[PDB]
Design an enzyme around this catalytic site. Structure first.
Site, PDB file in Angstrom:
ATOM      1  N   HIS B  41     -16.641  73.014  -2.916  1.00 55.35           N
ATOM      2  CA  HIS B  41     -18.026  72.848  -3.344  1.00 55.35           C
ATOM      3  C   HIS B  41     -18.903  72.243  -2.256  1.00 55.35           C
ATOM      4  CE1 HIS B  41     -18.011  68.502  -3.696  1.00 55.35           C
ATOM      5  NE2 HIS B  41     -17.009  68.509  -4.557  1.00 55.35           N
ATOM      6  N   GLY B 143     -20.702  60.195  -1.035  1.00 52.80           N
ATOM      7  CA  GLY B 143     -19.955  60.668   0.112  1.00 52.80           C
ATOM      8  C   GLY B 143     -18.456  60.527   0.013  1.00 52.80           C
ATOM      9  N   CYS B 145     -16.247  62.534  -1.924  1.00 46.98           N
ATOM     10  CA  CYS B 145     -15.488  63.756  -2.145  1.00 46.98           C
ATOM     11  C   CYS B 145     -14.735  64.115  -0.883  1.00 46.98           C
ATOM     12  CB  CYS B 145     -16.424  64.891  -2.531  1.00 46.98           C
ATOM     13  SG  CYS B 145     -17.302  64.549  -4.032  1.00 46.98           S
TER      14      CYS B 145
HETATM   15  C1  LIG Z   1     -18.798  63.955  -3.399  1.00 42.14           C
HETATM   16  N1  LIG Z   1     -18.947  63.761  -2.155  1.00 42.14           N
HETATM   17  N2  LIG Z   1     -19.800  63.724  -4.328  1.00 42.14           N
HETATM   18  C2  LIG Z   1     -21.037  62.983  -4.008  1.00 42.14           C
HETATM   19  C3  LIG Z   1     -21.257  61.786  -4.896  1.00 42.14           C
HETATM   20  C4  LIG Z   1     -20.234  60.879  -5.133  1.00 42.14           C
HETATM   21  C5  LIG Z   1     -20.431  59.789  -5.962  1.00 42.14           C
HETATM   22  C6  LIG Z   1     -21.655  59.590  -6.565  1.00 42.14           C
HETATM   23  C7  LIG Z   1     -22.681  60.481  -6.338  1.00 42.14           C
HETATM   24  C8  LIG Z   1     -22.486  61.572  -5.508  1.00 42.14           C
HETATM   25  N3  LIG Z   1     -19.702  64.258  -5.627  1.00 42.14           N
HETATM   26  C9  LIG Z   1     -18.960  63.493  -6.630  1.00 42.14           C
HETATM   27  C10 LIG Z   1     -19.971  65.591  -5.749  1.00 42.14           C
HETATM   28  O1  LIG Z   1     -20.478  66.228  -4.844  1.00 42.14           O
HETATM   29  C11 LIG Z   1     -19.645  66.256  -7.086  1.00 42.14           C
HETATM   30  C12 LIG Z   1     -19.799  67.786  -6.994  1.00 42.14           C
HETATM   31  C13 LIG Z   1     -19.559  68.462  -8.318  1.00 42.14           C
HETATM   32  C14 LIG Z   1     -20.587  68.656  -9.226  1.00 42.14           C
HETATM   33  C15 LIG Z   1     -20.352  69.216 -10.471  1.00 42.14           C
HETATM   34  C16 LIG Z   1     -19.071  69.589 -10.823  1.00 42.14           C
HETATM   35  C17 LIG Z   1     -18.037  69.415  -9.933  1.00 42.14           C
HETATM   36  C18 LIG Z   1     -18.277  68.860  -8.686  1.00 42.14           C
HETATM   37  N4  LIG Z   1     -20.546  65.712  -8.087  1.00 42.14           N
HETATM   38  C19 LIG Z   1     -20.102  65.140  -9.211  1.00 42.14           C
HETATM   39  O2  LIG Z   1     -18.932  64.810  -9.387  1.00 42.14           O
HETATM   40  C20 LIG Z   1     -21.213  64.913 -10.265  1.00 42.14           C
HETATM   41  N5  LIG Z   1     -20.597  65.072 -11.570  1.00 42.14           N
HETATM   42  C21 LIG Z   1     -21.123  65.873 -12.498  1.00 42.14           C
HETATM   43  O3  LIG Z   1     -22.162  66.504 -12.326  1.00 42.14           O
HETATM   44  C22 LIG Z   1     -20.364  65.987 -13.818  1.00 42.14           C
HETATM   45  C23 LIG Z   1     -19.383  67.152 -13.790  1.00 42.14           C
HETATM   46  C24 LIG Z   1     -18.724  67.388 -15.108  1.00 42.14           C
HETATM   47  N6  LIG Z   1     -21.372  66.160 -14.852  1.00 42.14           N
HETATM   48  C25 LIG Z   1     -22.310  65.203 -15.005  1.00 42.14           C
HETATM   49  O4  LIG Z   1     -22.327  64.148 -14.407  1.00 42.14           O
HETATM   50  O5  LIG Z   1     -23.196  65.548 -15.960  1.00 42.14           O
HETATM   51  C26 LIG Z   1     -24.280  64.601 -16.185  1.00 42.14           C
HETATM   52  C27 LIG Z   1     -25.180  64.514 -14.973  1.00 42.14           C
HETATM   53  C28 LIG Z   1     -25.815  63.321 -14.655  1.00 42.14           C
HETATM   54  C29 LIG Z   1     -26.620  63.238 -13.525  1.00 42.14           C
HETATM   55  C30 LIG Z   1     -26.799  64.334 -12.711  1.00 42.14           C
HETATM   56  C31 LIG Z   1     -26.173  65.521 -13.025  1.00 42.14           C
HETATM   57  C32 LIG Z   1     -25.364  65.618 -14.151  1.00 42.14           C
HETATM   58  C33 LIG Z   1     -21.938  63.541 -10.140  1.00 42.14           C
HETATM   59  C34 LIG Z   1     -20.921  62.420 -10.358  1.00 42.14           C
HETATM   60  C35 LIG Z   1     -22.564  63.393  -8.755  1.00 42.14           C
HETATM   61  C36 LIG Z   1     -23.036  63.443 -11.200  1.00 42.14           C
END
Ligand SMILES: *C(=N)N(Cc1ccccc1)N(C)C(=O)[C@H](Cc1ccccc1)NC(=O)[C@@H](NC(=O)[C@H](CC)NC(=O)OCc1ccccc1)C(C)(C)C
Ligand SMILES: *C(=N)N(Cc1ccccc1)N(C)C(=O)[C@H](Cc1ccccc1)NC(=O)[C@@H](NC(=O)[C@H](CC)NC(=O)OCc1ccccc1)C(C)(C)C
Ligand SMILES: [Cl-]
EC number: 3.4.19.12
Lengths: 300, 300
Positions: B41, B143, B145
């Protein structure tokens, strides 16, 4: 998100750990520039430890009695001197991996990472606090003496601890890197006990701030208190006094959350006087005190 | 003596961490031999994550779109392949710090160390368990992931986890190094919930043995239980069923202490039915389940 007891990355310190052997004793040394630091009791037999005169025992040692191995390579000792309770062995080779570093003496309540070692081989890394009674609640098995504790700031390694001994109660005592023991302990076989330990109040507050920052707020309340009134209660529950310097160090967390330090102190007072009533904070059922204000900021 | 949540020394893994950037997204990659592994991703914008077609997005990608930096130096990408949810970038230089390594897929209940990283820079190390619901309770900030989890065995690093995402509950989800997610999760912005988490009973038992070995034994009792009778109670408190394979894994600790596994199960039953009544075990007020039987043997 997430909050864990987190150690510093240990690579820089792994490159400094060596094995030191005198007779049958093998323990760990710290190799920085052309000096190897280790506990001076490396030169003592178990029988010498009853009433050792380290000056005498060291006059009877030659550089060739000290075997130093950096991995598979032997390091030639070319001189030795004693600074308080730490032996300084000068070697013919400067550690090419010496990081930028300092020796610092920490205050009770301060945290550091410990690189546990066995005969010069790193085994694990964990976070520790210098207890108010100047012990540490570590994991140091046989052959762990000479293992060091440290903090890292901008690629500079601040060494703060070297492991020397374990009391009959299982708690651990050691020195700073200038050989001065933390607490009332000595490197000889005599009666010694740690004083009664207390809770590191400023760290508990920092951890409550970590809880808020991480969404755990059930313990908050509208109330405020004064510092004197808080410490009167704190006194009763075996907490360390909270000074105005502590209040100042907590300021940045107070700002981030918008909760005055004295507002959080009233929350803590209430937890002390009523317990938690089955709930938890950051997944803990007790108040955690091995997170400093700086640890929380670094991780939040 | 002493028992502590302990991570493996992180040096070997620090020498593998790099920064990977595709467009505006920056995260961490793992550099082994001439290959860099990272979450696929990394190629998605915030808009792609709704229903991402990874195959289509990558057809429009050139190696020169992937910017990889190891410290101050850039690494030239010369190829890519997608294996499940992990992107593999072929680079022109073999990492001179590549350790002996393997890729392994762990089972729930097993533990591993995590080197938390930010833009290719190690920030800290901590110990985690794969929860029975295939999540991990870590600390993964901005940062993070691409940060990896690992075990070390005789100078060999067994990589078992790569961080991809965080669920709305704050729990963390990821893949093995072949890109297969742990649990039922997918790398897309869709509603996703973790199954019910339970307590890892065999680990709680190993930890009770760690306590006994270290002198914390107030919870022991004379009484025994049957395996079925224990699991009838355990189920009620959301513990995993204890199997006979679990009892057998506890055997060496049972031998060391002379406490039959089912005798310890009756001690645990009573702790569940009556609480701790104010006491603690190894300084914890809750039963700890993130130490495997092997973890305890390593540290005791
Ligand atoms: C990795 N380097 N990062 C950046 C980051 C880390 C910690 C905190 C903020 C940013 N992350 C974790 C990502 O890039 C991933 C990518 C991703 C997105 C969606 C699905 C799978 C992978 N981001 C996340 O893990 C986000 N998680 C979600 O969007 C989850 C997935 C089920 N849903 C969610 O949170 O729904 C509610 C919501 C709230 C706010 C914004 C969007 C959605 C993340 C933890 C960054 C929200
Ligand atoms: C460092 N590498 N070691 C070896 C070691 C580590 C962990 C477990 C066992 C051995 N250690 C810790 C030492 O070399 C020190 C040296 C020392 C001895 C005495 C005073 C100061 C330093 N050994 C210890 O720490 C021992 N501790 C003690 O002997 C304490 C000191 C107050 N006294 C004590 O326990 O008296 C009763 C007793 C009972 C049984 C044997 C000896 C003494 C040690 C933990 C090794 C007992
Ligand atoms: Cl607890």
């Amino acid at each position: 998100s997430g909050f864990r007891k987190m150690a510093f990355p240990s690579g820089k310190v792994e490159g400094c750990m060596v094995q030191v052997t005198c007779g049958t004793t093998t323990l760990n040394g710290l190799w920085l520039d052309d000096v190897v630091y280790c506990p001076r009791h490396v030169i003592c037999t178990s029988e010498d430890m009853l009433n050792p005169n380290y000056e005498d025992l060291l006059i009877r040692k030659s550089n060739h009695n000290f075997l130093v191995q950096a991995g598979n390579v032997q390091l030639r000792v070319i001189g030795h001197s004693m600074q308080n309770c730490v032996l300084k062995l000068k070697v013919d080779t400067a550690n090419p991996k010496t990081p930028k570093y300092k020796f610092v003496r920490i205050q009770p309540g301060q945290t550091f990472s410990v690189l546990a070692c066995y005969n010069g081989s790193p085994s694990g890394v964990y976070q520790c606090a210098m207890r108010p009674n100047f012990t540490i609640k570590g994991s140091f098995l046989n052959g762990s003496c000479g293992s060091v504790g440290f903090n890292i700031d901008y690629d500079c390694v601040s060494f703060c601890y070297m492991h020397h001994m374990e009391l009959p109660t299982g708690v651990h005592a050691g020195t700073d890197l200038e050989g001065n023991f933390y607490g009332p302990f000595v490197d000889r076989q005599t009666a010694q006990a740690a004083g009664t330990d207390t809770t590191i109040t400023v760290n508990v507050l920092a951890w409550l701030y970590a809880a808020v920052i991480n969404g755990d707020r059930w313990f908050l309340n509208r109330f405020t208190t004064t510092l004197n009134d808080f410490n009167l209660v704190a006194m009763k529950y075996n907490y360390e006094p909270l000074t105005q310097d502590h209040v100042d160090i907590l300021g940045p967390l107070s700002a981030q959350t918008g909760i005055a330090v004295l507002d959080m102190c009233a929350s803590l007072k209430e937890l002390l006087q009523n317990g938690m009533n089955g709930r938890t904070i950051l997944g803990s059922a007790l108040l955690e005190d091995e997170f400093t204000p700086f640890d929380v900021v670094r991780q939040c």
